[PDB]
């Protein structure tokens, strides 16, 4: 069972130190590889669109999920970003500045979409919701 | 249970409630000291002397009749064994096992039993050096141990 002796503090403190590495949440934030992820620990990121693509939805569903390959300015990274509304891919062009956010679930793929974990949130400095809601034109 | 086995037997002695000797022990405390002293000068160890008294001379317990433990009776007379009785008997056994192996080196069970004996010898010598019943430099040497005993 557990070690309980009054002078066992060194054994107990060490053991929790070893065993915390077996917790995925701990090791994820303490191993260093979050800085090797494309965003490098940022909430949003600016990018430039390389092309408009569109990706198939996973088996139970059947749709064309429309995305864009954008290239990250800070580190040259290339990622695929979902354009999340009805017909909102039209507002997106090629060689246009774009603001990329997380898509949810903290770097894990979301919904039926295979392999996409970024969403486009701004284009040309105009809110993408604002474009889908006509408030501000680009 | 056992230190070097899995047996948990409780076979042992049960000394009575009465510290004093039974009424019929009509010896003299000086006279029995001669009985202990003669047995030692005959080379017998304390554990065997107590058996002798109990079996021929009808002494149930020495601590009752004399008030003193046997080894302390010997020690006051300058007859206490140099290596304690129990340590000696282990050292005798490990010597016996090593001689048997030096003809049977594929007796892997006897090699196992050897390791247990020196583990027992060294744990006990750790104790006796601490309480100064052995010289602080006394060392159990595998080779030069058959000379010490027997």
């Amino acid at each position: 069972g557990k070690t309980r002796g009054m002078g066992a503090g060194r054994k107990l403190k060490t053991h929790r130190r070893n065993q915390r590495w077996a917790d995925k949440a701990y090791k994820k934030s303490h191993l260093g590889n979050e800085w090797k992820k494309p965003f490098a620990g940022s909430s949003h990121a600016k990018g430039i669109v390389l092309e408009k693509i569109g990706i198939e939805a996973k088996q139970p569903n059947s749709a064309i999920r429309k995305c864009a390959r954008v290239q990250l300015v800070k580190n040259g990274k290339k990622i695929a970003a979902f354009v999340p509304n009805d017909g909102c891919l039209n507002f997106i062009e090629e060689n246009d500045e774009v603001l990329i956010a997380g898509f949810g679930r903290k770097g894990h793929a979301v919904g039926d979409i295979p392999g996409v974990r970024f969403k486009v949130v701004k284009v040309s400095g105009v809110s993408l919701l604002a474009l889908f809601k006509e408030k501000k034109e680009k | 249970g056992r230190m070097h086995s899995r047996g948990k037997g409780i076979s042992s002695s049960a000394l009575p409630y009465k510290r004093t000797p039974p009424s019929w022990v009509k010896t003299a405390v000086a006279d029995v000291d001669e009985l202990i002293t003669k047995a030692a000068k005959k080379g017998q160890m304390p554990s065997q002397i107590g058996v002798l008294l109990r079996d021929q001379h009808g002494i149930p317990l020495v601590k009752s009749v004399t008030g003193s433990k046997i080894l302390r009776i010997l020690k006051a007379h300058g007859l206490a064994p140099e290596i304690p009785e129990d340590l000696y008997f282990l050292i005798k056994k490990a010597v016996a096992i090593r001689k048997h192996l030096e003809r049977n080196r594929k007796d892997k069970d006897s090699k196992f039993r050897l390791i247990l004996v020196e583990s027992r010898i060294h744990r006990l010598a750790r104790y006796y050096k601490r309480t100064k019943k052995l010289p602080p430099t006394w060392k159990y040497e595998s080779a030069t141990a058959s000379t010490l005993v027997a």
């Binding site: 309980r4 002796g5 009054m6 | 409630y17």
Partner: protein, 128 residues
């Protein structure tokens, strides 16, 4: 492989849970006896009787069916007379009955006596 006052107190609970009339405690000690005095003066056990054949010695306790649980806190903490309150809540059924026995330089006693005499000490067990 012995650490007594666990063997004593667990024997009483197991005897009590079954509903027996008496319990025997093979190793005894002054610490164990002083714990039974505290239990008895508070009314959770009847009298008890020491056995001297020589040895650690034996004690037989007469149980009155109204001890609910008695435990030992091995790994005996130091206990200022200030955190009495926090060990009280964690270990006792309520703020009304139950006692934590603490060994203190004015003797073994329950946490109630400890506050009055303003002494802290090292926890031994509890009963309720």
């Amino acid at each position: 492989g012995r650490r007594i006052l666990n063997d004593a107190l667990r024997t009483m609970v197991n005897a009590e849970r079954r509903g027996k009339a008496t319990a025997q405690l093979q190793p005894i000690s002054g610490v164990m006896i002083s714990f039974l005095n505290i239990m008895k003066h508070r009314g959770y056990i009847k009298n008890f009787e020491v056995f001297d054949p020589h040895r650690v010695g034996k004690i037989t306790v007469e149980l009155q069916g109204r001890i609910k649980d008695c435990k030992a806190l091995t790994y005996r903490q130091d206990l200022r007379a200030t955190e009495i309150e926090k060990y009280r809540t964690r270990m006792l059924p309520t703020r009304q009955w139950g006692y934590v026995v603490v060994t203190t330089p004015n003797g073994v006693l329950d946490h109630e006596e400890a506050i009055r005499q303003n002494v802290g000490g090292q926890v031994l067990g509890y009963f309720h």
